[PDB]
Paper text:
A chromosome dimer is lethal if unresolved, but most bacteria encode for an efficient site-specific recombination system to convert the chromosome dimers back to monomers, the Xer site-specific recombination system. Most bacteria encode two tyrosine family recombinases XerC and XerD which bind to the specific chromosomal site dif located in the replication terminus region, although there are notable exceptions where a single Xer protein carries out the reaction. The C-terminal domain of FtsK forms a DNA translocase motor, which also hexamerises, and was found to be essential for chromosome dimer resolution through activation of the XerD recombinase252627. FtsKγ interacts directly with XerD to stimulate its catalytic activity, leading to XerD cutting and exchanging the first pair of strands within a recombinase synapse between dif sites.
Residue numbers in the entry: 2 to 184, 214 to 263, 271 to 276
Amino acid sequence: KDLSEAQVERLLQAPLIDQPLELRDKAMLEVLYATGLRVSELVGLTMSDISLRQGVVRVIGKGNKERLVPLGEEAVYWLETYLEHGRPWLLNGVSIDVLFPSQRAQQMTRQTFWHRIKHYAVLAGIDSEKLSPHVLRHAFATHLLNHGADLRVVQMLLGHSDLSTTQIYTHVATERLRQLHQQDPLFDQAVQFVTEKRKASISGVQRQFRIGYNRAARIIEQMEAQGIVSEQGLAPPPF
């Protein structure tokens, strides 16, 4: 509307993670998707706003009021990965507190990050000129609410109410913070992974090739078709 789930998934998958710059953008997109943060708040995050251990980001929103927004598992993974393996290459020795610095160690603006988002939207087969931040945020929201594994209860009560983007993300943050307060080209690669590791799980295929949940799922499905795996409720091991 006009964005499909499939366009959302391609967009998140488009970044090329051997490039520090795109690995940054990958983390940025995953945070945006999970948290519903505004682009202006995203590009303004500091290192001190993140807690990977707690799984939350601190955002100064309305009234300049600090609140904690749960990041989710994918954003945590890609943040970790970015911090270890991408961000140092963006500084080249320079020392700054900006979480997502530009190519040349400066804070990005909403508009320069938006230029990045347009680049990935093209690869994803999206009209990058028609696309706007509010349409993007709302497609992220809708997709999150419909596929977040921990959000099925929220999906059931509110998925059909056609809430605003902000309302979806507020309900998502509430539910996720409640829980925290309680204590295909990859097919041949995938076949060799599953026949080797012997466990066939959507989660493992997902984290093994760092792809989205639904792509991992459609890869365990192309396998049940071709005769390779046991059914949720078979092929010999290589070597």
